[PDB]
Design a protein around this ligand. Structure first.
Ligand SMILES: Nc1ncnc2c1ncn2[C@@H]1O[C@H](COP(=O)(O)OP(=O)(O)O)[C@@H](O)[C@H]1O
Ligand SMILES: [Mg+2]
Ligand SMILES: [Mg+2]
Ligand SMILES: [Mg+2]
Ligand SMILES: [Mg+2]
Lengths: 186, 319, 228, 320, 319, 314, 228
DNA sequence: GCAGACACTACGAGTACATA
DNA sequence: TTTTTATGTACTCGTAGTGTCTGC
């Protein structure tokens, strides 16, 4: 900045006035906050018997049913809507779930399985190599573990872990680590 | 007093209000809009309402008309990233030699596939805010990214109070009466106008459309009232047969509605919902869901609908 | 050892047939499609001195394209492969040979029952017209004493009735009558001239294209007719 | 003869397509509104919809343009993507006609979800060019049209006649089918055939004409064609008498006889048992037979399914 | 007279009928096809039947042959919406310089994922109806959307009358004799051929397939007849295990009779009617009828049979 | 005996390569050899409700004895874009050496492959002159009816008494040869006979248990007692851990048809008799209403709730 | 019958108006956009010797570019279009006449309400300035004695009041006052000098451009103004 | 007369929907 | 108070690669 004066502009003004569209793209990606949802305002109405009209709100049978399926008191209604409610309207689905699900303040955290990304990768590798289903692959993994041939088999299969395969293994970019984990597999 | 555009032949397009005072809005919304027009400068506004025909585009143009702004009306679906990089920058950076505030109206900007462009727009707002303002209108507010919603004054149309609704409906009755008088439509019974207003609320566009449709013979008398207060797709015969547990009439009615099974089942559930006990609501939705789930599976469809009728007639507890 | 850019451009074409390739000691490379509908071979200049199986050939060639042309390629001490060039060094995992589909045996193509030739310009015109006329199969036959290639759109012409394109390749001189059908999807060859050897016996047969860089053999379609 | 004939078409329902509103067989209120529109000289934005096919939505959409003498552009709705709207449709709506006619865009079958975004681009379009051009949409599923577009158009629901309207429409369709048979060379040896064809496929007039063409393979509509149309596959005396006697073994023997044409058998059986049983037994008969018919396409052994139905009925019916 | 495709080695594909007269069809349906051919123009047709191997594809190709039509055969599972925009529109818009009718055969067009494509067809079939007609063949008519069914002549196969069935079985026996003559198979007992025809009706494809199967020795003696009648032996082991309430043997016998579940439930009802006390007949019919009517939605057949065995062993009283 | 030294799993290392090497019932082996003698191969569905009898092995052996260019496809991998792509390219193109081409689709009833089967409907008639399909299935009802019409359905097994004793003899001899080849010592031939008897006719499970015991080098008590694939679900049912069962439902939501039967089998031993009957009722109703359920995860979760609440473990 | 490059360029320019064309035997070709915005007619040197409708004119011109310039176009024995080259032959489909939107008869333009002339240089400058200032609409009007073309950008200027470009053609000795708005998208003609005729009768109107080889009729915008 | 400009296509990302 | 099932199909947007013609 040769001109040592200037009130100085923000990054957006510098990007736009200069018409450097890469700086404009970065400034726009600055606002790339993502993932907005208000499904739990609907579920609360189902749980707390609040008044709530879905004639103007977005509805999700999968999200509503999976949220209500976290507590056994609602499992009868979720089961019924999972059997005979698939061909119902979203309004009808919501109406039934309000009429049937018993009242209760039950909000909590969903039950999610925490997986060994390395073990998932090993099972997927064994299923790809031997063209078997998932449980057959797990049985192969058990047999190769209790035989000591697993380091040998993993060594023979280390070349099969392409960078697209790791996308199927796990979306966490820390997948790079497993990559090195598989590079050092001897 | 009323705004008439002789270029338009469609009634709802011919009588589009041109001023904030002419629009039929909630009291607080109209007060805020009058304040905006009085203070002389227009902020960044987002007018949204999922219910169509409440007045978003009308109010945007009326704000621009009251402020006497240099308005650039743009179809939101055409406001792609190149439009922001080009025409919007060209309009923002152009010098104004008349003191008119520059305002960009982006009508119906709630497309998800434009999110990226919207992000660019946000950055645009941080560079040319001192030169122009933006009035977005939308139906799905979730189609507008969160930074845009946060940077603007978000006004939710079609969300009135009960007294607001009474006042708006009286104003709409008066406006339809003035439209009839301008159009040469004789009003023999104001109950027709009242029924139209109450039936098509809060969609005013659809209200004026219904007025144009039912005012075909030029007179609004008791016949048009009976036509408006009617339901041409009413299912009442099936509902009354179920209420009476009339097996003969249900057996006769099964083939009448068996042709459009999906639509009839939907409408029948929708109608029974409001006329039965809560536990009857549970049972009705279970019965209807099962019967519809086995639609393509059953052999005789008319028999399947008669089976549904028997189930409902036996298990329903009408309030 | 380094891979000259002609070797790299050849391997990029060999990746179009098989996603991986097995390189064995010698100045000769080959690959075949996993379904066995096309096979390729090529005598290459750069000497291959150690056997190495590459499962991901396109990613390997992307690694190659980045770090110069005089890149020294070898196998690493641990067991993988190494690519060193002045400024950098990259390690690539060496896959087990059983993880890559290899043709195992160099197919000795029999003495051709029909021979012809096709210039690079003729093949380019044929590919352009096929991209234009939606042509997906070709039929090499004998028409009025010359050897012709007729291009058909098998989608809108399931029986190959209406000839959409025709090309002449010279006289035949022989005494046999044939109609070798070839699906255009099985021709992954790079532009150039090609000596075309069509062989058939009973129910078996093949079409070999000897080019200026590599030889591509392709399998005939099911309902090909000949009288050899 | 006041019946339009597309000489270029061989399919019956395409050959005999009405070209004016008066020729169209419509409910009273709908035809009245269409005559009113054609009388007003200008066409607003319209949406003709019905879950039932073959009610006349496309026919009336073309006939409105014909009567008003409007410069029409008939577009396949499924090709009406957003770039098509941004291109030819905008140019057509903004430009004027060389002869001063009103321009109308007919978007036939516009009720796909994949076009919703395109429909979104439309909701400003329809307000920008409403002075010069209008849009007439055809739909089967109204929910395939976004609610703003419904708000912008006059929505007209086909296939919703009154009882007297339905009687009159069936009379008119019978007369039209008789005139069409006269033109085509189909001898009508029994008018009951035409009446049953009209009543059977109502309100699908396209299916009506198509089935008229189907059952006229022998050039005549005699009594055999009537038995085929109404599905008269005989009597169910053995089953009924064995149910009344509670002859379980006879019913086990009779199941495979009627296992073949299950839908006809179950319908006829319901119709016959309805009259020969006590009112208390009527509800239970409908329950049993409805469950059995509902689970048909799932039952692995249809003969065993019919045996199960027979046993239930023989045990639970009270034969008056 | 019999049509032979020498390129085919599978017997059911070698002798595919090429004309309508060669087909074995009900009287009225064959008459309809002959009328369509005699008129010279083919309409939009939907040949359907849930029973495979009734001749829908055969009759489509035979109609196109007898009319001498420019036919485009298409696997319906590939007829996506771009396949209609491209190949189908190119085929239909191409002219007919020789006066032949253009017909598109969409074979097996009943996948749900094609619905949108089918929707794109309902205007297509009306734009090109002058020169191009469509012949859809399906197993599940519910996979065809209602507008397409409205635009077509729907013809349901595999649903003949008793006289039609008698005549079709006669013709099928004679055709099988001709096929065994051509193929070199010795028929030492015509009752074997009659048994094949009466067993596999109306799936003629499976009739010819089982003819190929049992003619492995080249001759059809009376020993093959006991193998064709499909009696599959008796079921004394399961009945005794049910009487003894021996759960382990019932679990062991579940996968055995999971081979042909339909035949097994039939034989089970037929036999166990005699071995349970009269007081248990209604309950046993409830159990067996439910287990049979819920089979098409049972994921695990062996588990379904185990469940049936447990119910019977727990609730039945034996004589 | 056929051996593949490149393989490290015994069931992949010692897989029979011919029909004769397979240990099958007399009638089944005779029909297979007649089919191979016929010269060509039609579309065939090998069905075996009882596992481990060798439908994959018999399919590969058919391809080997008829000398066919075989492409082996796992059913779960046989998605529709794979059928449109490589499979079409294989079936429409002739082989270099004039062999008949054959596609082997293993366990085609396992997953959401119904659209692939409805696609295969026309695929099988479009290329029948050059390519045949061999589908293997444990539950024949998983194969759509048009494919069953287009294929010859061969149901496996159900051996006679003489067949059973001869097959057990052959399996004992094969186990002895495999032990001699792998270097494993047989302390008692009665133990090998008892293993073959215990796991009959699940030969694959026998070879799998042998491969599990392989690390020792001898054969002693491989019949064990203690020392599963559903251990997590079983333990969480015993503990009445509703949250862990809810978390486990999506894991086995993959192959419900297999999991539900495996669950019934594993529960049968560990619970009281009246609870055996009750488990069969609950699991059977759940399996019965599976075809209606839209999300198998929730269906499996409800099954878990019911079982956990009603089981009286021993 | 060959196709001189002038004829092929004219056919390309016509293809920009309608994806397909219906050309009949003679030396006269015509086309009209499907949305009825522009119409074109022209005489050309090469002689059409058989009636045929092309569904995809652009692809036809592409395959024409794919062969020698002296290629021979004829009617094939099957009834399609046979393009004979040296060694190759291309068969292009003949479309059904009903499947191509074409004018029924050459529409005779009425007697003009105003007449002027546009030099090719002025037209080229107008097009290049339209690329520059991004003007999307024009208005032919009168400016104190002369006839002028005003160029507006309707995106940023919706009322057509801010004139971005201005061109002066000839003078107007009449007494009428008019303002014919034309959308730039409908200017589908090739460069050249054009006598510009303008016709208007109340609600009806059109603008014709007469060139030495082709005539182009263009529809005016709905909100044009005139007093004829 | 050849860089550059203009247009066209191929592909990744995001969204949406039906059915299981 | 929390928050996403697999497969197949369809659409739109942005951008980068790519081919091809042309202006001082
Ligand atoms: N009949 C048989 N004879 C010999 N070994 C068999 C037989 N059946 C299965 N096996 C063993 O099972 C393994 C593969 O079994 P597989 O064919 O997958 O059975 P399934 O398909 O029923 O699970 C092979 O390694 C083989 O050793
Ligand atoms: Mg608006
Ligand atoms: Mg229509
Ligand atoms: Mg078929
Ligand atoms: Mg297996």
């Amino acid at each position: 900045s040769l001109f040592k004066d200037d009130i100085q502009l923000n990054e957006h003004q510098v990007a736009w006035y200069s018409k450097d569209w890469t700086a404009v793209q970065s400034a726009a990606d600055s606002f790339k906050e993502k993932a907005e949802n208000e499904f739990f305002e609907i579920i609360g109405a189902i749980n707390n018997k609040t008044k709530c009209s879905i004639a103007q709100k977005d509805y999700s049978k999968f999200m509503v049913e999976n949220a209500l399926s976290q507590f056994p008191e609602c499992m009868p209604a979720v089961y019924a809507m999972n059997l005979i409610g698939s061909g119902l309207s979203d309004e009808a689905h919501f109406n039934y779930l309000m009429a049937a699900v018993p009242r209760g303040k039950r909000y909590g955290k969903w039950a999610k399985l925490v997986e060994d990304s390395t073990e998932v990768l090993i099972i997927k590798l064994l299923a790809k190599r031997y063209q078997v289903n998932t449980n057959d692959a797990i049985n192969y993994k058990s047999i190769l573990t209790k035989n000591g041939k697993l380091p040998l088999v993993l060594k023979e299969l280390k070349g099969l872990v392409t960078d697209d395969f790791l996308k199927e293994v796990t979306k966490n970019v820390k997948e790079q680590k497993q990559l090195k984990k598989l590079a050092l597999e001897w | 007093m009323i705004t008439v555009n002789e270029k338009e032949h469609i009634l709802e397009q011919k009588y589009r209000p041109s001023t904030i005072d002419e629009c039929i809005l909630p009291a607080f919304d109209k007060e805020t809009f009058k304040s905006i027009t009085s203070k002389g400068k227009i902020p960044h506004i987002i007018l949204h309402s999922p219910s169509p025909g409440t007045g978003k585009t009308t109010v945007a143009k009326a704000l621009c008309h009251d402020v006497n702004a240099d308005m650039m009306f743009v179809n939101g679906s055409d406001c792609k990233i190149d439009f922001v990089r080009g025409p919007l920058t060209n309009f923002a950076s152009a010098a104004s030699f008349d003191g008119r505030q520059k305002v960009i109206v982006i009508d119906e900007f709630d497309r998800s596939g434009l999110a990226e462009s919207q992000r660019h727009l946000r950055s645009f707002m941080e560079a040319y805010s001192s030169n122009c303002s933006i009035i977005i209108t939308a139906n799905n507010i979730d189609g507008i990214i969160k930074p845009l919603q946060s940077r603007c004054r978000v006004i939710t149309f079609g969300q009135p109070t009960d007294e607001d609704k009474i006042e708006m409906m009286k104003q709409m009755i008066r406006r339809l009466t003035e439209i009839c008088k301008h159009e040469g439509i004789a009003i023999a019974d104001m109950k027709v106008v009242a029924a139209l207003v109450k039936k098509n609320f809060p969609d005013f566009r659809k209200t004026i459309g219904e007025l144009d449709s039912y005012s075909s013979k030029g007179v609004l008398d008791a016949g048009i009232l009976s036509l408006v207060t009617n339901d041409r797709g009413a299912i009442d015969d099936v509902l009354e047969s179920l209420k009476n547990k009339d097996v003969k009439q249900l057996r006769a009615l099964a083939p009448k509605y068996a042709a459009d099974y999906s639509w009839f089942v939907g409408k029948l559930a929708e109608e029974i919902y409001s006329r039965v006990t809560p536990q009857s609501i549970i049972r009705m939705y279970e019965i209807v869901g099962e019967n519809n789930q086995y639609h393509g599976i059953a052999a005789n469809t008319e028999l399947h609908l008669a089976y549904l009728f028997i189930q409902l007639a036996c298990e329903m507890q009408w309030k | 050892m380094k891979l000259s850019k002609d070797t790299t451009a050849l391997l990029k074409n060999f990746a179009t047939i098989n996603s991986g390739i097995m390189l064995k000691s010698g100045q000769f490379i080959m690959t075949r499609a996993v379904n066995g509908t096309t096979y390729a071979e090529a005598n290459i200049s750069d000497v291959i001195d150690f056997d190495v199986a590459i499962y991901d050939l396109n990613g390997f060639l992307g690694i190659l394209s980045l770090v110069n042309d005089d890149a020294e390629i070898s196998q690493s001490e641990d067991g993988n492969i190494k690519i060193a060039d002045a400024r950098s060094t990259i390690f690539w995992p060496a896959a087990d040979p059983s993880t890559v589909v290899a043709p195992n045996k160099p197919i000795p193509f029999p003495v051709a029952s029909a021979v012809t030739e096709i210039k690079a310009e003729d093949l380019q015109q044929l590919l352009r017209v096929s991209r234009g006329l939606q042509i997906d199969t070709i039929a090499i036959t004998v028409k009025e004493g010359k050897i012709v290639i007729n291009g058909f759109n098998k989608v809108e012409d399931s029986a190959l009735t209406r000839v959409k394109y025709s090309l002449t390749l010279g006289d035949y001189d022989g005494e046999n009558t044939f109609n070798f059908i070839i699906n255009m999807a099985n021709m992954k060859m790079q532009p150039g001239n090609y000596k075309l050897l069509l062989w058939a016996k009973g129910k078996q047969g093949a079409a070999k294209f000897e080019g200026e860089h590599a030889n591509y053999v392709v399998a005939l379609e099911a309902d090909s007719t000949h009288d050899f």
